[model samples]
Target: DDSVLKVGASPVPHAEILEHVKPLLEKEGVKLEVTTYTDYVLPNKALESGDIDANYFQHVPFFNEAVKENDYDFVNAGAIHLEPVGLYSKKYKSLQEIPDGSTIYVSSSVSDWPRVLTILEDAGLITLKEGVDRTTATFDDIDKNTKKLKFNHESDPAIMTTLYDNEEGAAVLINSNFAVDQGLNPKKDAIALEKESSPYANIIAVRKEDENNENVKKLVKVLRSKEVQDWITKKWNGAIVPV
Candidate 1:
């Protein structure tokens, strides 16, 4: 009578969303154990090392990047939601005020460069290629950098909030999960935000063998249900979106 669903998730949106579904899954005879992870690397390591059942902290590109490099035997259970990436700056109220040759700190994760550059492009600071697959675009794809902005990507994605709090660079690119956890709302606080049309959906990742696990199936169903989706909409006000 103790069927368990152990999943690791990011603190802000992923764990919060899973928090809502805990009681629902409990009623269905499954105990949901959500372990919150602050960093990007550990969740998948925990999953692969059997410290948890599954991990829910990464998007498809990141998931694919990890899988390719580490060769983890995992599968995408389902996409729960998408977190809009944002550019946060303590010194500037807008991207316009971000001066030339100043640094813009980004994540060390290469999969994130596309979205970062695209947001800067959308904000009129940089220009990407005429037609390129932004999901896999590199920094070299930037056709123009009118502001002579230097992107320092030495920081990890999870540590972006700390840099923003410390005001380390001209701006820091943070995904909404970290932003919300730090009390920064992407819709309001960001100098520039990623479009909802971007392809960065946060998905439930399970080991390849557990792809059809019953409790995992129910978890995804409940997360994608009307109630949970509505909660995400009302809670974050379009900052974190249900897909």
Candidate 2:
């Protein structure tokens, strides 16, 4: 039997966590190899083409969007963990402190824009048009803003960095994965956070053709193993949650 296993993951916790699993796999006579990717797109494409056996980089919603938009047949074999998007504030200690007409920066990406918008709405600062779903909630979707707040749309990765230069009483929406890499502690630092039991959990995905393979099953089991889950719980400090 071949001892090699090649997997693709994000450069942060996914890859970093896998480093801990490497020794466990080694003890089981499996030589684990992990390839890291920076963005969300290429890794899925690589997995679909059999360039990698499995990928642990994306959440269920993101993976679903990829398959729907690109016509791929990848299935999530395991629900590994979740990274809650956080609302980080530089000027205000609480959401109530944000004044009317304040400018808040939100990610405009397809994956996170609506979610971030909902977070703001839940905080009572804005409102969205009724019946609007995630894909449809653009700036135009704001039917009412009780506070008459202004929104700035930018790339998700750049939102946090922009807070330093902007002057209009800004709060930025940042994903937990990026925050972790930037050495920002979300639990201690965020003004507000998406609830822990959020529906947007991350998953381990495998190609449909290999979904039932023994090695794939083992990979899924290992990902949710007690050791891995506990490691995430203690290490991430509530930012990276295991499911």
Candidate 3:
């Protein structure tokens, strides 16, 4: 049987993690073929159309959003770990000390704005509407912003680097994977960070119909196994933490 199990994933963490377990899968009579993608939407579409067996790129919230919005069928079998989304700054030592009326940059797009707003809320910089989650956050969601800080909305990746061009920029919420790619230490440099137990935990996702499939079960088990957990603990160097 030359049938290969194709798993679509992000190039940084998901694909890299799968590569480490490829040899392990080989011994288990499975040929693991990992396809890497950078964009968030395509992988889900690929999995829905049966172009791939499954994907390892998105979190539980994101997976649910895709299924609801796009009419795809996906489910979270088990969580991989939590990536502590951090508030990084090149200009300030801490969120509280950033001076009054300072500008704080945040990702402008729909996907990142919520997480950014949550980080701000957690830092006591702003507040949100009665019930705003990751999918429905906007500038108007700020119920009570004490610092009078201007919200600069730009792409998530560019927000952090933009700090170099603007000294007044105080903080930016960056995804852990991109933060690692930028060589930023979230633990030491972040003024405020999401707790390890935060709801932003990542997961191993599969289609709803295949949720109980034996192969999918094995894949999820391997993802959460001690060996893979140990690898992530050592490899990501705190950029990612196992659940």
lDDT of 3: 0.73
Candidate 3 residue pairs in clash (backbone atoms < 3 Å): none
What TM-score, computed on C-alpha atoms, does each candidate reach?
0.95, 0.87, 0.84
lDDT of 3 at 140: 79
| Each model's lDDT | 0.88, 0.76, 0.73
lDDT of 2: 0.76
Tell me the alpha-carbon RMSD of every candidate. Answer: 1.5, 2.6, 3.0
> Which candidate has the highest lDDT of all?
1
User: Ten-residue segment with the worst summed lDDT in candidate 2?
Assistant: 159-168
Compose the digit string of candidate 3's lDDT tens values, residues 1-243.
344778888776778898998888777777888888866677888988888888887677666667788877677878887777777777777788877887767654455567767667777778777886546677877888888888777554534544633553777766666666667667776778875444656777777788876766777778888989999888877777887
How good is model 3 by TM-score?
Answer: 0.84
Please count the clashing residue pairs in each candidate, in the order shown. Answer: 0, 0, 0
| Candidates, ranked, TM-score | 1, 2, 3
Tens digits of per-residue lDDT for model 1 on 64-138? Answer: 999999999999998888888889998998888877899999989998888888787788888878786766898
